[PDB]
């Protein structure tokens, strides 16, 4: 008989180079020598937050007592963006939990124990340097503008909801970073745009997608759900009506197969119903600490897209 | 036989008044009575950070159980900028470690012990109020523009590297604070501008000045050097190339005879070579605490100016 | 959405420009002075927020 013990894996690959086609962090895993630097049995502490907004998802990691060779490989490439993937689970499988580029790295080795630090960004390089220069005339179909701008961003299309037969009412011009322009189109058309684990997600506010996840005491829930406001401020109201404005909170054992834009079903004894996801935070302490995930849910009032 | 014990001195002088010539904090030390208020044998905690950037270097200080007369002298002059100097060393000498103006001061005396607080700025008054209004035509030598703007700033010239026979390509106009205009000229010409302990330093990025300091176990080093990135973010690269982009970290016993723009030689058993300095932080606890200095080094790839 | 530290500054800057930083705008003349030529301008543009509130430029 065994116990139920945690497991994880961390991989470091070649520098990421942006080209003239969508970037996939998967293909950069292999190093010039072939197999990548894998780190399994070392105490690790990490925190990974995810959201549906302009900003990329960022995660922090700490590793104790790394071998000198690995640290040397990171002393080099300090000018470059190494690709990194993280996996976690329970002794039988490990689900992808983050993938991005090493934004920052530093080492402090006071006496007894060295402590390496990381800051990782989910597509930070693309979202902050992809320039654009486009224009359109009166009568252009809005569905064409959306596709044109996304292709400029150079990322795979996770999911998109086209506008239909919508047409521009006035001439438009777009410059600067493509991400910023798209985030502005979100406000005026009730659409949510956010990149996550390399995938572009374009959806409509208020509406939600089946029960892709069910939460219950069998599903490793942790404590009862509690109602928490989804924003730190309140807006004036007429009392688009379809927009968000309500939510709840839940916690569960670590499970990387969840994304901010997904949908979940809450099977508890007090609260029951369907909710959207709005925010994720993954925490982990291998030898000591939690191994759980926190979800911020938001009520929905739109159509079932 | 003795031990190796710490010593320090703190001096407070007359209010600083800016005039029509370079400001020297040295000449304001003497008070109307003559000798200044010197504080030697009182537990003191201080933190002084220094850098090479637009912002002035600021340091914090705390003193316990001050006499009522001294506190009274600071209750007055609360509208004025008193000049302050700080010294530290080891029982045989004390090197100047900071000099500036008292930006802030507050007193809290709950029951047993009063605790005075200070915030000091290195040339804050000059850098934030020196206005300018200048213009030049096509063909003007850039070396003339630089000297004209610095004289406006009203500070002694610590060190400057002239541009040679460079000439303006387009007409230029400058207004507002002189410091801001100079900091903009830095970006477009690969030059570093930063005031420190009253001295103006204008140098060129990438290049460095002899071994003015050597670090080794004999030189009171504290722990091994570790590689740390010199910035909290990574820039996109073509992979001016001469710019910085790499660095290291070291710690040493308190030594005020060091400046951000200097050069140091690192004689350790793993790392060996020459580095620039980029950042300093001086910490100190007289009765209890550290008495060390931390240096952030940056690799260089330019000519040996 | 509103969790990141950068989004807060983004919204704050966006709102700050709304009440200041006026550069150019179209308008229509409503009052004309022929001695020392000057004109009174009524800006035409406006916006309506989702909260049923409107922003009108005053006569200049």
């Amino acid at each position: 008989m065994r116990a139920m013990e945690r497991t994880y894996t961390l991989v470091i690959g070649r520098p990421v180079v942006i080209g003239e086609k969508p970037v996939n962090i998967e293909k950069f895993a292999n190093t010039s020598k072939g197999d990548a630097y894998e780190i399994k049995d070392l105490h690790i502490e990490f925190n990974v937050k995810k959201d549906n907004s302009k900003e990329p998802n960022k995660g922090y990691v700490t590793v104790y007592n790394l071998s000198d060779e690995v640290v040397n490989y990171l002393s080099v490439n300090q000018r470059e963006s190494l690709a990194v993937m993280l996996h976690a689970g329970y002794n039988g499988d490990e689900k992808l939990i983050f993938s991005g580029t090493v934004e920052y790295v530093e080492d402090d080795f006071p006496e007894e124990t060295r402590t390496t630090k990381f800051i990782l960004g989910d597509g930070t390089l693309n979202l902050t340097t992809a320039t654009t220069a486009r224009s359109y005339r009166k009568g252009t179909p809005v569905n064409s503008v959306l596709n044109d701008l996304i292709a400029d961003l150079k990322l795979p299309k996770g999911r998109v909801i086209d506008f239909g037969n919508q047409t521009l009412q006035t001439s438009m011009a777009f410059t600067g970073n493509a991400s910023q322009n798209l985030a502005n189109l979100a406000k005026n058309t009730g659409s949510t745009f956010s990149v996550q684990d390399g995938a572009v997600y374009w959806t409509k506010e208020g509406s939600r997608f089946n029960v892709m996840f069910e939460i219950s005491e069998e599903g490793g829930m942790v404590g009862t759900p509690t109602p928490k406001q989804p924003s730190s401020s309140k807006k004036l109201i007429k009392a688009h009506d379809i927009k968000e404005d309500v939510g709840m909170t839940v916690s569960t054992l670590l499970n990387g197969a969840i994304l901010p834009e997904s949908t979940v079903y809450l099977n508890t004894r007090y609260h029951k119903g369907f909710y959207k996801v709005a925010e994720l935070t993954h925490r982990g302490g291998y030898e000591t600490g939690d191994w759980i995930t926190e979800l911020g849910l938001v009520e929905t009032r739109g159509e079932l897209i | 036989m003795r031990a190796m014990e710490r010593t320090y001195t703190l001096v407070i002088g007359r209010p600083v008044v800016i005039g029509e010539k370079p400001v020297n904090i040295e000449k304001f030390a003497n008070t109307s009575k003559g000798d200044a208020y010197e504080i030697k044998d009182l537990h003191i905690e201080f933190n002084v950070k220094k850098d090479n950037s637009k912002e002035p270097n600021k340091g914090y200080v705390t003193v316990y159980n001050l006499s009522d007369e001294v506190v009274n002298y600071l209750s007055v002059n609360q509208r004025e900028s008193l000049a302050v100097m700080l010294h530290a060393g080891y029982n045989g000498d004390e090197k100047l470690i900071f000099s500036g103006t008292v930006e802030y001061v507050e007193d809290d005396f709950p029951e047993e012990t009063r605790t005075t607080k200070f915030i000091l700025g290195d040339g804050t008054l000059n850098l934030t109020t020196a206005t300018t209004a200048r213009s030049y035509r096509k063909g003007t030598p850039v070396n003339s523009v630089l000297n004209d703007l610095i004289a406006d700033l009203k500070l002694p010239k610590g060190r400057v590297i002239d541009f040679g026979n460079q000439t303006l390509q387009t007409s230029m106009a400058f207004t507002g604070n002189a410091s801001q205009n100079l900091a903009n000229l830095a970006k477009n010409t690969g030059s570093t501008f930063s005031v420190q302990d009253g001295a103006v330093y204008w140098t060129k990025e990438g290049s460095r000045f002899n071994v003015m300091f050597e670090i080794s176990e004999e030189g009171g080093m504290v722990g091994t050097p570790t590689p740390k990135q010199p910035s909290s973010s990574k820039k996109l690269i073509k992979a001016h190339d001469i710019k910085e982009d790499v660095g290291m970290t070291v710690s040493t016993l308190l030594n005020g005879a060091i400046l951000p723009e200097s050069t140091v030689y690192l004689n350790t058993r793993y790392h060996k070579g020459f580095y620039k300095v980029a950042e300093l932080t001086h910490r100190g606890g007289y009765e209890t605490g550290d008495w060390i200095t931390e240096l952030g080094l940056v690799e260089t790839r330019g000519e040996l100016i | 959405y509103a969790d990141r530290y950068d989004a807060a500054f983004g919204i704050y800057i966006s709102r700050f420009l709304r009440n200041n930083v006026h550069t150019n705008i179209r308008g229509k003349v409503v009052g004309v002075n022929y001695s020392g030529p000057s004109v009174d301008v009524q800006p035409m543009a406006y916006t309506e927020f989702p909260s049923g509130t409107t922003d009108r430029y005053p006569v200049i």
């Binding site: 960022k58 800051i119 960004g121 930070t124 902050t128 340097t129 | 973010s233 | 990141r4 500054f9």
Partner: peptide, 26 residues
């Protein structure tokens, strides 16, 4: 003990600086 607290405050400041300054060609 203030040593422990200063470290956490420093790390939070570092995270905020990273959030403000990231990516970009300049």
């Amino acid at each position: 003990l203030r040593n422990m607290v200063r470290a956490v405050v420093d790390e939070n400041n570092q995270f905020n600086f990273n959030m403000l300054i990231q990516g970009g060609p300049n």
